[PDB]
mmCIF file of C-alpha atoms and ligand atoms in Angstrom:
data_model
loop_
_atom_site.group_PDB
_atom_site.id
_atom_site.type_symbol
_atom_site.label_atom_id
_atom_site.label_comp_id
_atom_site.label_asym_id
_atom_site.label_seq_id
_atom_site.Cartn_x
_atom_site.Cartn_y
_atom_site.Cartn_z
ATOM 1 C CA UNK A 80 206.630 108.248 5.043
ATOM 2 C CA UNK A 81 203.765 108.136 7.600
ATOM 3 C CA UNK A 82 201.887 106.832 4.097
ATOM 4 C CA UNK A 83 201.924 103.894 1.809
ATOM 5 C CA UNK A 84 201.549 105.208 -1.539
ATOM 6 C CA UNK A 85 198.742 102.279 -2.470
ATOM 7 C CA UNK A 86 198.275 104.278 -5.945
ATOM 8 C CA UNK A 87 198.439 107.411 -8.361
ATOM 9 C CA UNK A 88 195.770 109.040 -8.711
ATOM 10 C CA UNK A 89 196.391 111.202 -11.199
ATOM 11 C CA UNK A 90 198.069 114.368 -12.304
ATOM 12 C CA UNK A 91 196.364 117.290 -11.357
ATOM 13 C CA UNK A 92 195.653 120.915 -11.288
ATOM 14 C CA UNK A 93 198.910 121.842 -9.359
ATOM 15 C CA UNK A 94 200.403 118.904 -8.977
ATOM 16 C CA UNK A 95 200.363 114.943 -8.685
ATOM 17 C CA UNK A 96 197.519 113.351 -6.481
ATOM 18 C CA UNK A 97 197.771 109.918 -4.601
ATOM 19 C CA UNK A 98 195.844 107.734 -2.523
ATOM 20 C CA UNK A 99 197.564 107.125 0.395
ATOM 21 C CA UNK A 100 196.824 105.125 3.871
ATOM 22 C CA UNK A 101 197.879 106.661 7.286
ATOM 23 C CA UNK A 102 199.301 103.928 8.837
ATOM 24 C CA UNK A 103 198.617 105.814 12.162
ATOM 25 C CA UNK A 104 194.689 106.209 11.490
ATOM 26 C CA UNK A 105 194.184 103.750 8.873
ATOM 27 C CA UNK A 106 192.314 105.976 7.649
ATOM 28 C CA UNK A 107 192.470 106.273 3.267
ATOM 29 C CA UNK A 108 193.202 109.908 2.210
ATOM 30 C CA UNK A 109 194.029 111.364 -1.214
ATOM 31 C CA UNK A 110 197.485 113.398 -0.874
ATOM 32 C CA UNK A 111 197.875 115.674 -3.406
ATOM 33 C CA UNK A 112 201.740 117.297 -3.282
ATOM 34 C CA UNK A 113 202.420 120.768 -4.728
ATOM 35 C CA UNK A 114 205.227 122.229 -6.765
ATOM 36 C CA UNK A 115 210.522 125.589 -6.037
ATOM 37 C CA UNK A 116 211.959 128.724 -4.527
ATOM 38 C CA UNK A 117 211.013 126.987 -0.645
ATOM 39 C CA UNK A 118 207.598 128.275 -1.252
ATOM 40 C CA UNK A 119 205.381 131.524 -0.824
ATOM 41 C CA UNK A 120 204.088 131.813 3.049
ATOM 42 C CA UNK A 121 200.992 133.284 1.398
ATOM 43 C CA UNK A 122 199.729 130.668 -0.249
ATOM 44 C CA UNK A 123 200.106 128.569 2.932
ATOM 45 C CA UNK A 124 198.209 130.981 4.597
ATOM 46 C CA UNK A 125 195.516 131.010 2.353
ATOM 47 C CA UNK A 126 195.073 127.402 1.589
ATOM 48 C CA UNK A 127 194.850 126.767 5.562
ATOM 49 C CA UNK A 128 191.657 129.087 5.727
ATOM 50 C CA UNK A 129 190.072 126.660 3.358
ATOM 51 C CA UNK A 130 190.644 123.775 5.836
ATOM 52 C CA UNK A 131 187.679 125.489 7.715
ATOM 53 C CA UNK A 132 185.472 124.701 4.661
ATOM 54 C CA UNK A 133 183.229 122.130 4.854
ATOM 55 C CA UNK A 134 180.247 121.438 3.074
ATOM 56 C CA UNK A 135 178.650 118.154 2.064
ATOM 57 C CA UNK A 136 179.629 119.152 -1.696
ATOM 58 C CA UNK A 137 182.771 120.092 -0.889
ATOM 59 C CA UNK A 138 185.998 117.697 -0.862
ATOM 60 C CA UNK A 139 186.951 118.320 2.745
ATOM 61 C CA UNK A 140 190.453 119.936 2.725
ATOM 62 C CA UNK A 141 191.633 117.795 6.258
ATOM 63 C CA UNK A 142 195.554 119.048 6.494
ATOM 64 C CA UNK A 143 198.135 120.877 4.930
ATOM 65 C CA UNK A 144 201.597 119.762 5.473
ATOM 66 C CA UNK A 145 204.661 122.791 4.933
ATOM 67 C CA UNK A 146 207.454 120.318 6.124
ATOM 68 C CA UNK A 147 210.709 119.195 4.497
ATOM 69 C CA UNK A 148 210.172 122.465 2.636
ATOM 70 C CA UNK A 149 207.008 121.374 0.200
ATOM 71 C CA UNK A 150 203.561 121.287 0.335
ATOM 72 C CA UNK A 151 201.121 118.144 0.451
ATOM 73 C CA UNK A 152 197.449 118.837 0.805
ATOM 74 C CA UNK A 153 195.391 115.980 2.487
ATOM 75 C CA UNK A 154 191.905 115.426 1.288
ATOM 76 C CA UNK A 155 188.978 112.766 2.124
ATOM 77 C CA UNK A 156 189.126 110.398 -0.580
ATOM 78 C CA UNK A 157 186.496 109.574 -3.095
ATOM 79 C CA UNK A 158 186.627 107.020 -5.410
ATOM 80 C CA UNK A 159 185.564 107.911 -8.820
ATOM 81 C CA UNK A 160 185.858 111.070 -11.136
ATOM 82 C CA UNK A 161 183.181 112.500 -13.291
ATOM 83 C CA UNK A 162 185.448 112.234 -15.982
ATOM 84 C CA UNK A 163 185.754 108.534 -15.510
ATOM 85 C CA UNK A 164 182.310 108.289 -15.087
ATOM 86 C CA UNK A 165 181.291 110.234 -17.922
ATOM 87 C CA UNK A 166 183.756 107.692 -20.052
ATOM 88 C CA UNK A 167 181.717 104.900 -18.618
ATOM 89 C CA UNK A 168 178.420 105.841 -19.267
ATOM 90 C CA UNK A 169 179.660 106.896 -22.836
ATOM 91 C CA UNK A 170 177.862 104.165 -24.764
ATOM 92 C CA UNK A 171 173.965 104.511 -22.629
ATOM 93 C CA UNK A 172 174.942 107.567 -21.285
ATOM 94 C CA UNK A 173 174.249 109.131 -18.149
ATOM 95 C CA UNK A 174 170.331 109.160 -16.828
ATOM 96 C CA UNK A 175 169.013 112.969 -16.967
ATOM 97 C CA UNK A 176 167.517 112.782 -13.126
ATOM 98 C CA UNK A 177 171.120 111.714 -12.322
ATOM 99 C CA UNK A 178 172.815 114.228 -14.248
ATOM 100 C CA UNK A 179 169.948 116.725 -13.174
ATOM 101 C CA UNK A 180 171.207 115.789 -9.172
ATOM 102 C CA UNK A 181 174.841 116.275 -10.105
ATOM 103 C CA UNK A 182 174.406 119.788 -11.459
ATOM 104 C CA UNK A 183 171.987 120.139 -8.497
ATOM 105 C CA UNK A 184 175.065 119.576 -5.684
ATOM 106 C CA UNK A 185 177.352 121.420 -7.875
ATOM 107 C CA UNK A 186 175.714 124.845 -8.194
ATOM 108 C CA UNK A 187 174.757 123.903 -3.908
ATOM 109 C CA UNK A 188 178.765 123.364 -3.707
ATOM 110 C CA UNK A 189 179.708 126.514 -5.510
ATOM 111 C CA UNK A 190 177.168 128.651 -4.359
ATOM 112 C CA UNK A 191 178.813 128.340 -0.673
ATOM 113 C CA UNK A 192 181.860 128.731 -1.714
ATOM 114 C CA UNK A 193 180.818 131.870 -3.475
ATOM 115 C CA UNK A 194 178.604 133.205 -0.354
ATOM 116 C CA UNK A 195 182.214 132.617 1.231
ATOM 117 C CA UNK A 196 184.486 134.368 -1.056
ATOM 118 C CA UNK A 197 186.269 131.370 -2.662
ATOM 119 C CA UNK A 198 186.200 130.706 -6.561
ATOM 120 C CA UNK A 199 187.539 127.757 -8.150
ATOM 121 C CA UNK A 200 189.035 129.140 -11.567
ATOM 122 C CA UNK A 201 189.664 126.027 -12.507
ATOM 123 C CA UNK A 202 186.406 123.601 -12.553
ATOM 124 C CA UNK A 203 186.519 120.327 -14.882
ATOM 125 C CA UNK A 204 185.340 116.761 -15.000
ATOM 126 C CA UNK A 205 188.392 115.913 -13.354
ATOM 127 C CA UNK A 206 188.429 117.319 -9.667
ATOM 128 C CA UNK A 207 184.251 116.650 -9.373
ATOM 129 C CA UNK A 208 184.705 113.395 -7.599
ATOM 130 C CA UNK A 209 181.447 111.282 -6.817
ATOM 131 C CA UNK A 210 180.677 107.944 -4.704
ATOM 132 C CA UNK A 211 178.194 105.196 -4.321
ATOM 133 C CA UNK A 212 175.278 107.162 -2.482
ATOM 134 C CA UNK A 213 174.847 109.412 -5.405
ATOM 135 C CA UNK A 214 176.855 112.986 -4.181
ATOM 136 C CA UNK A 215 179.110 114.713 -6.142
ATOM 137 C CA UNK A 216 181.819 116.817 -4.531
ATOM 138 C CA UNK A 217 184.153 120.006 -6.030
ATOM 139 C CA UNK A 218 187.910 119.347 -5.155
ATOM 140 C CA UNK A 219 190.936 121.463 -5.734
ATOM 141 C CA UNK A 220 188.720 125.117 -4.556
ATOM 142 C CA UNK A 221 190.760 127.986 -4.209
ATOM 143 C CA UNK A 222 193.983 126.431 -4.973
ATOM 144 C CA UNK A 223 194.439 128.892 -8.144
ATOM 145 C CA UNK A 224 194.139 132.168 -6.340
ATOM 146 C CA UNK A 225 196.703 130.604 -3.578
ATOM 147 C CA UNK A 226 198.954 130.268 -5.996
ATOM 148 C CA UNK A 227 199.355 131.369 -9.512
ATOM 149 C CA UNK A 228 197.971 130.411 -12.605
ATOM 150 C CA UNK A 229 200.425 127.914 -14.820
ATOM 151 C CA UNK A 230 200.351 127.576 -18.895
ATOM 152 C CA UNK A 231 201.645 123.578 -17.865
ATOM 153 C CA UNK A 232 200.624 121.522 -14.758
ATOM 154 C CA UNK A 233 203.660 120.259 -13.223
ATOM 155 C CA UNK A 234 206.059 118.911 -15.535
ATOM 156 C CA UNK A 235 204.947 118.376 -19.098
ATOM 157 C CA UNK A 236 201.416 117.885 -19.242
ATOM 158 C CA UNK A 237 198.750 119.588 -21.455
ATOM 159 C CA UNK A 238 196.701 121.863 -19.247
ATOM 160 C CA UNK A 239 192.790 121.396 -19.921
ATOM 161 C CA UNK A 240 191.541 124.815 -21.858
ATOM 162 C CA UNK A 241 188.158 123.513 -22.468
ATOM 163 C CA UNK A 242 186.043 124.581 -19.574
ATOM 164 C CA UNK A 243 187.833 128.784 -19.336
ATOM 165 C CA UNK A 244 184.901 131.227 -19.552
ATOM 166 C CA UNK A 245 185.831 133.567 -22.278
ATOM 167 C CA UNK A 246 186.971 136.648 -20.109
ATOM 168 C CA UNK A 247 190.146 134.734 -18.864
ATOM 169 C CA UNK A 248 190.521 133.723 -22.273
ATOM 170 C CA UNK A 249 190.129 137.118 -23.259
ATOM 171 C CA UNK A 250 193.061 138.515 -20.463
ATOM 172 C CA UNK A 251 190.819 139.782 -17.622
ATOM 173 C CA UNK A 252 192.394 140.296 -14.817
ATOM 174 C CA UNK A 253 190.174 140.008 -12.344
ATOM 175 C CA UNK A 254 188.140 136.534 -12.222
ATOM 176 C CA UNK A 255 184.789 136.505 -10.625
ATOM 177 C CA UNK A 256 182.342 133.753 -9.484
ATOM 178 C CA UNK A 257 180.952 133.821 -12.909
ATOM 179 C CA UNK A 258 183.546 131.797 -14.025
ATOM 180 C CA UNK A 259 182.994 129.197 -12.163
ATOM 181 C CA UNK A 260 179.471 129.044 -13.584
ATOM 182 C CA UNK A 261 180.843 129.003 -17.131
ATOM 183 C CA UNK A 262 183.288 125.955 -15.811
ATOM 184 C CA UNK A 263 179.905 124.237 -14.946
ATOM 185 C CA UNK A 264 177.994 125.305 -17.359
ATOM 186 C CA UNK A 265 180.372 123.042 -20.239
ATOM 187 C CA UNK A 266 180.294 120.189 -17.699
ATOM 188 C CA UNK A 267 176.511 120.283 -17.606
ATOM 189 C CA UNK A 268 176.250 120.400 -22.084
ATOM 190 C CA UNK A 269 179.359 117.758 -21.675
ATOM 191 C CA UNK A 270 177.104 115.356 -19.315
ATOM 192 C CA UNK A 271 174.116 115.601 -21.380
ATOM 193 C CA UNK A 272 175.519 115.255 -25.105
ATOM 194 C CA UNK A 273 179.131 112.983 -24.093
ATOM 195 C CA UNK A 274 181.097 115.010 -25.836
ATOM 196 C CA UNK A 275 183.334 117.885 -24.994
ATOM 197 C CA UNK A 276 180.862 121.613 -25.764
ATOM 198 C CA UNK A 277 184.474 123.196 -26.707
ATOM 199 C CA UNK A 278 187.567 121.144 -26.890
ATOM 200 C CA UNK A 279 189.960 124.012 -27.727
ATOM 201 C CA UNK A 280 193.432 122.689 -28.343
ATOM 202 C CA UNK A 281 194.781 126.314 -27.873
ATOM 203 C CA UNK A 282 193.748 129.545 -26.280
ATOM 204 C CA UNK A 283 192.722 131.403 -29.849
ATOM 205 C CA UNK A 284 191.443 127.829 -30.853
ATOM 206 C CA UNK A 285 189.824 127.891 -27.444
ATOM 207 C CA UNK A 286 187.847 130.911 -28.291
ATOM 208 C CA UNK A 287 186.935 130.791 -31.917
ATOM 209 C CA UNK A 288 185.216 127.575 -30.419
ATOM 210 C CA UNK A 289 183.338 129.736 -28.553
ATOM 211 C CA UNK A 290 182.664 132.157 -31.170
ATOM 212 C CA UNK A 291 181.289 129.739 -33.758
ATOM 213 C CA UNK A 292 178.986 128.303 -31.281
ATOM 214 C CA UNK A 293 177.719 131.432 -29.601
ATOM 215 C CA UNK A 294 178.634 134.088 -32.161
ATOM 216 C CA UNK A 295 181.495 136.541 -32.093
ATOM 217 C CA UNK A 296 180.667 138.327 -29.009
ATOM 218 C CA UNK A 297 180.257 142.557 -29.620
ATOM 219 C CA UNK A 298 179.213 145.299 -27.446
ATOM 220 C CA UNK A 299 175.473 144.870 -27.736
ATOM 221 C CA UNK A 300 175.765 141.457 -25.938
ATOM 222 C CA UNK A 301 178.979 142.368 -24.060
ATOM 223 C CA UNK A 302 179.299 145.944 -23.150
ATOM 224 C CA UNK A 303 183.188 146.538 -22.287
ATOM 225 C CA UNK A 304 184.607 143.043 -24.574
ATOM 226 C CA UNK A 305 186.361 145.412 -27.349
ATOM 227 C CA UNK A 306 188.190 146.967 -24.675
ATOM 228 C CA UNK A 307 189.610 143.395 -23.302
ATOM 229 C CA UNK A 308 193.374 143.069 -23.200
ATOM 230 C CA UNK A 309 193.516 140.010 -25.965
ATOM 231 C CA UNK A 310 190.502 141.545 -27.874
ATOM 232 C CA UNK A 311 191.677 141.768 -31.434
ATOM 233 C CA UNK A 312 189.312 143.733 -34.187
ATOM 234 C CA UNK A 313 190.518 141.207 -36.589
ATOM 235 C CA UNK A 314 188.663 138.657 -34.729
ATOM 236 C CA UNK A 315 185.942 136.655 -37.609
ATOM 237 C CA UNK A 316 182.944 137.357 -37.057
ATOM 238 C CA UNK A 317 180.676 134.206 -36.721
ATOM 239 C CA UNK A 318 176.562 134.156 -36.389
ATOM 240 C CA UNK A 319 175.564 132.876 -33.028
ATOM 241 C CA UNK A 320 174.041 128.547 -33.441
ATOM 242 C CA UNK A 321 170.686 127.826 -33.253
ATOM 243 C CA UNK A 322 170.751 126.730 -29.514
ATOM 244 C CA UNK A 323 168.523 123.487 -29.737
ATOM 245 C CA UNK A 324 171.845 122.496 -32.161
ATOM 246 C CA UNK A 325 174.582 122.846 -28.532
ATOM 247 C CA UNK A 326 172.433 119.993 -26.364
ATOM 248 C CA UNK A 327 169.999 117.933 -27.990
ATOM 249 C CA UNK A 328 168.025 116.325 -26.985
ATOM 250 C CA UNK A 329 168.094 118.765 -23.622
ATOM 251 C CA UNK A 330 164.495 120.178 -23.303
ATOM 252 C CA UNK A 331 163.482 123.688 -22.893
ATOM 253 C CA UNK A 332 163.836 123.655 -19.156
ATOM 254 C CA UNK A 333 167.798 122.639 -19.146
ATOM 255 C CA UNK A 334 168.805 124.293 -22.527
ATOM 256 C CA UNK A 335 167.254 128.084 -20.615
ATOM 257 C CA UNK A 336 169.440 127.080 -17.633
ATOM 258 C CA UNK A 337 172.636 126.520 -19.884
ATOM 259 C CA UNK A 338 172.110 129.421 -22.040
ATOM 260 C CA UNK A 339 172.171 131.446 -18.723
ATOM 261 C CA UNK A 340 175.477 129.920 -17.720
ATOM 262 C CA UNK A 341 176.758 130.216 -20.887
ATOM 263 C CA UNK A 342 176.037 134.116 -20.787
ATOM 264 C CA UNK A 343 178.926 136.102 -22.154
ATOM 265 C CA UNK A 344 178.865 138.969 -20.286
ATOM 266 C CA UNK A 345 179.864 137.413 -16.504
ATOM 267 C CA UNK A 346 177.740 140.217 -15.504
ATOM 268 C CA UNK A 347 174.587 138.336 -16.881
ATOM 269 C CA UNK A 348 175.922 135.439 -16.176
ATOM 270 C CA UNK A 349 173.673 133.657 -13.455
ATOM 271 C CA UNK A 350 174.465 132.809 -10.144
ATOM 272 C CA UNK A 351 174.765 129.413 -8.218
ATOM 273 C CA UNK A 352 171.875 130.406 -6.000
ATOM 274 C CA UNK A 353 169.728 132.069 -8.616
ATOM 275 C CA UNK A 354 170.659 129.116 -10.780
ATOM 276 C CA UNK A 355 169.144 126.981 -8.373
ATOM 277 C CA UNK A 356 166.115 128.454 -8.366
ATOM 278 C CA UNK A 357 165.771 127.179 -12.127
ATOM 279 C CA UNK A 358 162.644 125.382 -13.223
ATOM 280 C CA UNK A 359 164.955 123.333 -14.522
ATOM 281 C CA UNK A 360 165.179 121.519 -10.867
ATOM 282 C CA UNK A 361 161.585 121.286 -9.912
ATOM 283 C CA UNK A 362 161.260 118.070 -9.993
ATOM 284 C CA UNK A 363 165.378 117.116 -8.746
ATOM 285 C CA UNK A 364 165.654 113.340 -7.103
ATOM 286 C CA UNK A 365 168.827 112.014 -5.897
ATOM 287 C CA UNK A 366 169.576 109.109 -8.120
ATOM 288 C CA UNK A 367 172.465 106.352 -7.335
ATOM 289 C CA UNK A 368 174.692 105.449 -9.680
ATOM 290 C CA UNK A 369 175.902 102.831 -11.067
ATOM 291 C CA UNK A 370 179.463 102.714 -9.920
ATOM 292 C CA UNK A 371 181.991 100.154 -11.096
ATOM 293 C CA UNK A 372 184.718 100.533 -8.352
HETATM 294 O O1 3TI B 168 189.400 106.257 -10.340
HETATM 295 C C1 3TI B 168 189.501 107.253 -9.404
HETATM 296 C C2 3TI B 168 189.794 106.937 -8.095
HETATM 297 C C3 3TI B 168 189.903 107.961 -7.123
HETATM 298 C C4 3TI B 168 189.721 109.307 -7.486
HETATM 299 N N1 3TI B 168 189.840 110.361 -6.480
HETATM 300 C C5 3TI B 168 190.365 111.685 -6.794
HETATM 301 C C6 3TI B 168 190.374 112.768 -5.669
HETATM 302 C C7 3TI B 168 189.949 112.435 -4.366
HETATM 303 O O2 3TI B 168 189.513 111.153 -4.095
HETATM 304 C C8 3TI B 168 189.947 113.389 -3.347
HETATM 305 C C9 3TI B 168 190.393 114.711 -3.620
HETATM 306 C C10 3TI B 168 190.833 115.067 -4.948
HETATM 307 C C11 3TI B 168 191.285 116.419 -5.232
HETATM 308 C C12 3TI B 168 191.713 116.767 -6.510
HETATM 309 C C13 3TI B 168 191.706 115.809 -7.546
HETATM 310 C C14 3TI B 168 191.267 114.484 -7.270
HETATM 311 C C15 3TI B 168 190.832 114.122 -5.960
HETATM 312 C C16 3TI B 168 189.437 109.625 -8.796
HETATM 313 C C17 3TI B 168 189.325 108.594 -9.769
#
């Protein structure tokens, strides 16, 4: 009420996002409002610590509003989406030294929220947001540990499977930073070849994607994955792909990177920081793009 709704956004993670004014500040904000029992007090807890995050490729969290029993979260508002973007660019896709930059910020963004205890679990094209000076930001961080994880979003919408590393697919309970990296990892092949790397349209669909591309993992390449709570023997067996097949026409540089993302075991998985160490980024610019606002 202390908004004008000038627009929605979208519908998100954990709820519906808008882009609202403040008619005190004037200042343009995206509002995103959550899911109702009157709420955890945990989760508000939580979600408040993150306020204190702030990092240039970070969407800075800048209130959280428990009033009238529900919960809006008020973010700095950028104006485009990778996902839009990616749409966009679909025909001449996007440069590599742009895309290079992008993954750049990203694995900068995650690796401090990493070196501060805070995972995303739920990375897509969808909450990277970008503007006209070339950044790219992560939104929506440590929303899903806050709360819980849901199989829908808020009311009846298909929840994106596409970028869940395999161990969440495969009933871990306990998500680590690697995930994250697997998130990025599909947004990185996604970027480079315009097409989803694994558009799952179910969990088991979901992973025999994975499979067929990367082979049926074992434990040779994944000590501990036949003891996972979904594991099933019965699982087919498929041959791991030729990797110059995921991401032509990546070169050596970025398809080594990937692969290391893509690692099964989240143990091997690499890290943001090591990832940024990469050859891959030797010669990183920071490209603007072309936005159509
Ligand atoms: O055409 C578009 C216009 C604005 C957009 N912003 C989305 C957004 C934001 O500007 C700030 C924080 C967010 C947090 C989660 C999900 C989306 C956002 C996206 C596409």
């Amino acid at each position: 009420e202390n908004f004008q709704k000038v627009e929605k956004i979208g519908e998100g993670t954990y709820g519906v996002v808008y882009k609202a004014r403040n008619k005190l500040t004037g200042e343009v904000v995206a509002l995103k409002k959550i899911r109702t029992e009157g709420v955890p007090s945990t989760a508000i807890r939580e979600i408040s610590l993150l306020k204190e995050l702030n990092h240039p490729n970070i969407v800075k969290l800048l209130d959280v509003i428990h009033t009238e029993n529900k919960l809006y979260l008020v973010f700095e508002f950028l104006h485009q989406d990778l996902k839009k973007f990616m749409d966009a660019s679909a025909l001449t896709g996007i440069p590599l030294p742009l895309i290079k930059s992008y993954l750049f910020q990203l694995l900068q963004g995650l690796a401090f929220c990493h070196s501060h205890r805070v995972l995303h679990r739920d990375l897509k094209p969808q909450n990277l947001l970008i503007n006209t000076e070339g950044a790219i930001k992560l939104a929506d961080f440590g929303l899903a540990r806050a709360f819980g994880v849901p199989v829908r979003t808020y009311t009846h919408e298909v929840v994106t499977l596409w970028y869940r590393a395999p161990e969440i697919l495969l009933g871990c309970k306990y998500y680590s930073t690697a995930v994250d990296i697997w998130s990025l990892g599909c947004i990185f092949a996604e970027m480079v070849t315009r097409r989803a790397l694994f558009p799952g349209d179910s969990e088991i669909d979901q992973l025999f994607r994975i499979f067929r591309t990367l082979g049926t993992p074992d434990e040779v390449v994944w000590p501990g994955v036949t003891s996972m709570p979904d594991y099933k023997p019965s699982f087919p067996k498929w041959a791991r792909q030729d990797f110059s097949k995921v991401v032509p026409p990546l070169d050596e540089d970025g398809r080594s990177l990937l692969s290391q993302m893509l690692h099964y075991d989240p143990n091997k998985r690499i890290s943001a920081k090591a990832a940024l160490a990469h050859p891959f980024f030797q010669d990183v610019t920071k490209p603007v793009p072309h936005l159509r606002l």
